[PDB]
Amino acid sequence: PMPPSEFLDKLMGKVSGYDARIRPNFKGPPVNVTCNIFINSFGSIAETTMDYRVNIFLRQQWNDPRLAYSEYPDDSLDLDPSMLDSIWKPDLFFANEKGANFHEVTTDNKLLRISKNGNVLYSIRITLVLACPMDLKNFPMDVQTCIMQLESFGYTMNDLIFEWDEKGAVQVADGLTLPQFILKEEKDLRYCTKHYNTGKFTCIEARFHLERQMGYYLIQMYIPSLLIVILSWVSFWINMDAAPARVGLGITTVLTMTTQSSGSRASLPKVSYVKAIDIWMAVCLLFVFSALLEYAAVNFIARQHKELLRFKTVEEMRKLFISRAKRIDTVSRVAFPLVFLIFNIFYWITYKIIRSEDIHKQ
Amino acid sequence: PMPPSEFLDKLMGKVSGYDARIRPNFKGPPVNVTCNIFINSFGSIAETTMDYRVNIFLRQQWNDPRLAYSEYPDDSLDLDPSMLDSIWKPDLFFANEKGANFHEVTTDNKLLRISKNGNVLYSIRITLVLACPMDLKNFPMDVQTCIMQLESFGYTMNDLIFEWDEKGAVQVADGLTLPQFILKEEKDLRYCTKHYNTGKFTCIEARFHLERQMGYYLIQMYIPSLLIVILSWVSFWINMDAAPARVGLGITTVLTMTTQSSGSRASLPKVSYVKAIDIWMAVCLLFVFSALLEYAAVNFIARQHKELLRFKTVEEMRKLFISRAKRIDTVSRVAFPLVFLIFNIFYWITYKIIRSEDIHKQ
Amino acid sequence: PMPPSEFLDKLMGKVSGYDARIRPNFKGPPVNVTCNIFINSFGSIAETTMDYRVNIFLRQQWNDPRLAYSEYPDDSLDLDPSMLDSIWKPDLFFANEKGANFHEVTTDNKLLRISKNGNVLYSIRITLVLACPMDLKNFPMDVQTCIMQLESFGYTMNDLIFEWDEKGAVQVADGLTLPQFILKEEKDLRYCTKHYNTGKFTCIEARFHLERQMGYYLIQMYIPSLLIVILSWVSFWINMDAAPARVGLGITTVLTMTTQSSGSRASLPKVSYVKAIDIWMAVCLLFVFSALLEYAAVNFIARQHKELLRFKTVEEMRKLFISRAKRIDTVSRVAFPLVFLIFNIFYWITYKIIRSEDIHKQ
Amino acid sequence: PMPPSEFLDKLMGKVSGYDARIRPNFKGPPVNVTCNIFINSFGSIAETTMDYRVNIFLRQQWNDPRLAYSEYPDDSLDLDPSMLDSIWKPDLFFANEKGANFHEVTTDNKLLRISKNGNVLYSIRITLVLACPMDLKNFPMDVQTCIMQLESFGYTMNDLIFEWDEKGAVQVADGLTLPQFILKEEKDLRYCTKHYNTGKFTCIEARFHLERQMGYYLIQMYIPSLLIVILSWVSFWINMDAAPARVGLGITTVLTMTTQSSGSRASLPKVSYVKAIDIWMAVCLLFVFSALLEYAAVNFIARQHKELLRFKTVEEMRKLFISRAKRIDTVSRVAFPLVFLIFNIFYWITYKIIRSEDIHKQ
Amino acid sequence: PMPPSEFLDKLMGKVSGYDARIRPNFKGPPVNVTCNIFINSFGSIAETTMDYRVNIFLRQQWNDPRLAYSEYPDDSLDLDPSMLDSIWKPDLFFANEKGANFHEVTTDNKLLRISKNGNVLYSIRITLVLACPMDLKNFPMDVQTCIMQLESFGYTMNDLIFEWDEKGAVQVADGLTLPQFILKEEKDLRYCTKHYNTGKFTCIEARFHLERQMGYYLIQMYIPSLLIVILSWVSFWINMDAAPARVGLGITTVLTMTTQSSGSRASLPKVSYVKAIDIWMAVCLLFVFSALLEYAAVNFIARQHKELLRFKTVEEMRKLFISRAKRIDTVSRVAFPLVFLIFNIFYWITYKIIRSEDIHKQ
Ligand SMILES: CC[C@H](C)[C@H]1O[C@]2(CC[C@@H]1C)C[C@@H]1C[C@@H](C/C=C(\C)[C@@H](O[C@H]3C[C@H](OC)[C@@H](O[C@H]4C[C@H](OC)[C@@H](O)[C@H](C)O4)[C@H](C)O3)[C@@H](C)/C=C\C=C3\CO[C@@H]4[C@H](O)C(C)=C[C@@H](C(=O)O1)[C@]34O)O2
Ligand SMILES: CC[C@H](C)[C@H]1O[C@]2(CC[C@@H]1C)C[C@@H]1C[C@@H](C/C=C(\C)[C@@H](O[C@H]3C[C@H](OC)[C@@H](O[C@H]4C[C@H](OC)[C@@H](O)[C@H](C)O4)[C@H](C)O3)[C@@H](C)/C=C\C=C3\CO[C@@H]4[C@H](O)C(C)=C[C@@H](C(=O)O1)[C@]34O)O2
Ligand SMILES: CC[C@H](C)[C@H]1O[C@]2(CC[C@@H]1C)C[C@@H]1C[C@@H](C/C=C(\C)[C@@H](O[C@H]3C[C@H](OC)[C@@H](O[C@H]4C[C@H](OC)[C@@H](O)[C@H](C)O4)[C@H](C)O3)[C@@H](C)/C=C\C=C3\CO[C@@H]4[C@H](O)C(C)=C[C@@H](C(=O)O1)[C@]34O)O2
């Protein structure tokens, strides 16, 4: 029978001794805050500035003794979010972030629900440009581990304690997909406490293990390099007397291998360690460069042939240099793709075992 | 005869018991909100970040019993938008969005119209960077279905219910055109209710079917690839003894096919499935590569010819290798464009039937 | 003798019955608002997102009967812009716009001048990213017509009427120049009234006719294409037996024509109609491709010559094929630039007459 | 002995008749405002959108008679910047600007100092994206004159007059350097008064003469073009019978000259007048194109030689065509670099005299 | 026993004489402020606009006598950051900065702690786009010294004095790494006082010495240039009669050296001094150009050979020109890589000694 306006100005009134600046149960045990997040959107992962953009529904549960009411019989009592000025919302800030803008569209995207015993549910929708450092030791295949850290500002560990939720940890939205990565099902909850000269502060973090998909990099980078190496193999069947043809074919394959290697590393930060694509493009470039060196040795042997022919064992030395120049081409035509196939299976199995070692060590 | 200032401070006065924080007909049936949007601008569709930018006139109709007035005889009573602080606007937020900024130019772009019985018309102009996931299984021709979701924050299904309008669904502005797409005439209205641990929330959505126009991709991508394949066909008429000419022509056609294929995929996200342009550029690249292989086989047969000529059935084996080397060119000159025409009609009709299957299944 | 503070708190005081929420002459004829704009900056015209950025001094003149004063003898009475909270500024918003931010530097850039009879002058400085659709049927030469629409939000046609000024329409700043376009001297004032389900709203618009300057596109695009076609003509004088030279020259001219055509269309939206540069680059590419086909026919005739010479009317058939192979080069050397000159004068006069037809139809 | 709180609420109190909306010495002579700016940062000069970014310390000095105090004996009395709401700051706005955001970091970056007789010192730190039109008649060497205009909004010339400072004009920070330009020591102070239909408004402007440094453009653009022309000269020493070598060398030099000319104009607005780099790249491209034409004439004369040799004064006509084909190469080998050196010294001295004429006319 | 609300409204109440506009110990000695910063994130260093982005925890310690309390026995008394409106926070602003936005996510990221004797701890989290000028005299290896200046606005040196902290200077976060640079362990604290016409202002600055990592630039830039020079060395073994082969190989190596040099300078400001990569690419380009000149001299000597052979000491002059043309190739094949190795060791040791001289002079 009681009207709701006096009831919802009674608990936050200045005739009441609420004092929203003062934390609950002052001069006592620390407040325990339970947090669960809901990943609404995850994406826009950029490697060159090492950050990613999430959309989260940050839900914070804490108990306030002064907020308890015994008049109304309903337990939930969902409230309007405009009177969220004097409730004592806890301070929370993300340790590694940029941006972090609120959503003010059509209303402030906020949820306030005060239970009968004093439990408060506080939900806010925020997009954060979270910055995570990434390791690029293996660029085509890799398991990145993005770190999201939630800690407090201005309340030490003896006054405010952040804890993860027990029923579930992180709720991902159904149907959420990433175009370039695959989000793993398990998520780590390791809370570490940062120490500062001012004091220690409560901090909880969650880790997402991101598997990079290998379907795009196989089409864009691995197959055109094989096309270039196969073309340099095609140069072996051409006639050895046709010098501009073989020289031009080999030179253009080396040039396009260099430009392809320079263009695949363009969308990447300037890291200072050797990656896997470096190894792949280096061995492919070495293969086309060795093909050009093989033709240069063949044409040098033919040069020695032509100088000793035109100005005495001349016939059998002509035979020896033509037979040797034919033997080099005949053994190269078999030896080049076989050693390339050997390198391919060795590289692929060692990266398969180091990828499985990364997924086993985690 | 009554002056308007007391009348428009009477209904929102604190001497009145309006209490704009409290929802209408509290502790009763849920409020029913009818929404229709007006697409003022639609465009700026970007594939690489999978989002689009709309300009909408969001109109929300709901009934308030406390707002009803019986003094004035006029039914419409358009009001000034500055006193839209205490009216109980309903909470609405878009589920998949970025940005969503209001228009504050020369006034707040808002409309408030309170009917005599209590019906409230609330119109706001907002630009939203709506994020939609897109399928790129067929890149040149495709029918994208952009999804716009409108749901509530902080009021469950038992307190707030969102419904679409019956007289029309979505009003598009007259003369509105898209440079890259064609907006279909019908629009789906399927409302789905999202479930969360806190509770269930009302949500309505509208789907726009976007037909990608095929006029640009025919000019930019399909015809230059045919030019490259026709040039590789031109290489068959050149003399077989002119080895640097045919080798250089074929090698430059393969190189430019590779760079054209790499440059057409630049304005696209790094997806991990095979698209239609992948198939097209792959078959065209296979055609120019097979032309280079055909010349390599011709010059290998001529090599065998020259070695058996210069160091016995020599005349008729010279005839056999010249006749075979002529026969390969003569059959290739007919066989290459005919099998290309067969591939063209097969690819085009299978993509026509899969495009019509996509438009029939919807 | 009267001090100014009471006089300027008398007309906007709450002891006065001003009521700035209520429109002037309520329950009567509609308010008539006269608007003239002053183009301070115009520029930053981008084709790929189809919008332009203006800086305008929006001046709005309307009459308020309650604001009239008879105490002071001065007629102008320029006022301070801080008390522009309660004046009843009219609602105005641009129909096709993005951005539209106010200038808050060192003060709010505003002007308020209330005349003695009640005329109010309201000037504000705003930069608007106005979005206009453009037609690219003729890309090098074209007359774009940018549309600026000013309409009201929340006041129908019976309550608020917008009208253009009679003394002048749009004042452009002296010395204002555009690097890529030429602003015409006349400007259209056609007011159209938009109709919505809620009601009809007053709207006035102004059109600027923008002539695209042809000096840059002649240097960047038209002359290098002529350089490529002239180089392909140079290929006719080279010796026909030198096959790698003529083949390589023609192939590189075709390749660079393709890359030049692909690079000139890069700063353009993905439109689906044929433009004028498409026609120009297509005919130039057809010319260099026909030159390569002409050399392929010459070397095929020489192939027939060489096969019938080396394995009977042999001398006179050698004469016939050498004379025909010389005649093809001799007639091509004259016939190629003459038909190119014919195409040039036909293309140029038809685009001159369609440009003058566009400027005559307007 | 008087406490400072009553003294600094006495002069701005509502029990005082200060009335900060009303300008000082109302209904009298115009207020005289003295302005000096301090260039803290100058840079980020972009040619393609024709604007530059400054950081200025805007100091405004004006006299207020009502602010005068005779109680305290100190003359300076530096005040706290939070009570800068009611002081009657003058209206000032920059005529050609974008952005112009204030600095709110750790405090509002403001200075308020009220002298004993009524002199007020008002300093604010602002970064402005000032838009200046630039002339690109000579692109490598040029003296740009950036214009910064400071005028008033809403106060005419009879009420507010802006004047420059007498002790100095513009203070540049010590150690301030520009990477691409050189700031001259003198600065023009020409005040021009803008006229509008509403009235005339006071305006003062300052001009900075910016000398473009020529060290970068000599390395990036002038020397690689000389490398290309020297390579085309190297083509003269190669054997005339080696036709693919000379043809390929000349064709690749023409192609790379075209791409170098197209790439140096990329970071520039689409202007419609001929610049100096246009002239330079055009003459260099003409030189490499004439070298290709010279080889085409040599090989045409050799063609006439070969046709009259193989199907009568045959020996002496063979002599005449070989001697003429040698004479063309021998005279070209001397004549090409000498005429290039003549063009170089003529171009360089005419641009030196037109640069000195620009610096003498100013 | 005293409740906290009256105690925390007593010290900031208007019944108290706090007067937060007035600085502490007015008309006396200057306030001494001790500042220490905590580098939370450091990165996003861009060379082309010469600025870097930090995340700092700015801690300011100063003593206020009026804030001292003797009632409560606790010494720390951490307070809520909402009542940081009237505390007299000191004015601080960074001298060389852009941006500098506060963090408003979930609360204002602020810390307020008032000691018992009057010591105030004020911590704020800010991201600043700090602009630092950089010297690019040596581009691959360099030690940049970023300067962060903190000074006051509106309080002179006699009223406000800024001092660095004695216990530590700048705290870097543990685990913080930079992908492109290495942050040195020592940091300079040199405070310089800026002088202005208005007065002198306190300023303290901190310098970070940044070592550029050399691992990326060795892979991206130094090794492909060696690949190009090694390929030009490979051109010496090819047959001298094969003129299109050697000419084409040398010409494409010169062309790709030019494009590689133009592409490595793309991500750099337009500086006007010679860098180290300029010297490296210039010597490598000189090496490949000299190889092309060596082949041109060889083919000129062979031209003289062919003209004196075909139209008398003819045999021994044929011997002299073939022996000399062989001797040039034989001495070049040894002389080119040896002088390249000499240049490599000289360049590397002189840059090692100038890098160590830069790290010794600091
Ligand atoms: C085979 C290599 C040699 C070099 C051949 O290369 C060329 C011609 C002939 C050579 C012998 C080169 C190559 C294509 C082939 C033709 C082969 C087919 C048409 C396709 O390929 C197959 C193989 C591919 O598994 C390696 C396989 O993918 C799976 C992987 C995943 O399941 C594990 C899954 O995601 C999904 C099921 O799909 C799939 C069956 O498709 C063709 C689609 C390959 C892509 C072509 C690419 C298009 O743009 C690329 C690039 O811009 C380059 C410049 C041109 C193309 C090219 O490089 O062309 C290109 O790389 O011709
Ligand atoms: C003549 C064409 C053939 C192909 C010739 O081309 C080449 C060499 C010889 C060939 C026979 C090609 C060409 C230049 C010429 C040399 C000609 C001159 C030096 C200039 O040209 C004249 C002609 C031009 O009117 C067509 C005329 O403009 C007027 C137009 C307007 O009044 C109506 C007005 O705005 C103003 C008065 O100026 C003007 C008198 O200048 C030279 C300045 C032309 C520009 C050169 C361009 C620089 O970058 C361009 C591009 O990056 C490309 C890659 C290289 C250059 C080129 O393409 O070089 C380039 O295009 O040599
Ligand atoms: C040796 C030079 C000649 C020209 C050879 O070049 C080619 C073939 C054969 C020529 C004789 C060229 C070159 C690679 C080699 C093959 C050599 C190996 C595969 C690798 O190299 C070694 C040498 C390198 O120390 C110079 C050394 O790095 C250390 C430095 C640091 O410790 C001090 C530390 O960070 C870490 C330990 O690693 C390391 C042991 O790896 C290979 C990984 C080199 C990188 C290849 C690059 C990939 O993209 C680049 C570029 O896009 C270009 C276009 C193609 C590649 C290339 O240019 O290919 C490329 O540059 O083949």
Short description:
The structure is a homopentamer of 362-residue chains. By secondary structure, chain A is α+β, with helices and mostly antiparallel strands.
Q: How would you characterize this protein structure?
A:
Chains A, B, C, D, E: Glycans are attached at residue 32. Chains A, B, C, D, E: Glycine 1 binds at residues 59, 123. Chains A, B, C, D, E: It comes from Danio rerio (Zebrafish). Chains A, B, C, D, E: Residues 239-243 are cytoplasmic. Chains A, B, C, D, E: Strychnine binds at residues 196-201. It is classed as membrane protein. 5 copies of one chain form a homopentamer. By secondary structure, chain A is of the alpha+beta class. Chain A has 2 domains: 1-213, no CATH class; 214-362, no CATH class. Chain A contains 5 helices and 14 strands. The first copy, chain A, has helices at residues 4-10, 215-234, 243-264, 276-309, 314-361, and strands at residues 31-46, 51-63, 78-79, 93-94, 97-102, 110-114, 119-131, 143-151, 160-164, 170-172, 181-189, 194-195, 200-201, 203-212. In chain A, the strands form 3 sheets. In chain A, strands 1, 2, 3, 5, 6, 7, 9 and 10 form an 8-stranded mixed beta sheet that branches. A 4-stranded antiparallel beta sheet of chain A has the order 4-8-14-11. A two-stranded antiparallel sheet of chain A has the order 12-13. The longest helix of chain A is centred in the C-terminal third of the chain and has 48 residues, at 314-361. Chain A is rod-shaped and about 125 Å long. Chains in contact: A-B, A-E, B-C, C-D, D-E. The complex binds ligand IVM (3 copies). One ligand IVM sits between chains B (258, 261-262, 265, 272-274, 278-279, 281-282, 285-286, 289) and A (215, 218-219, 223-224, 226-227, 230).
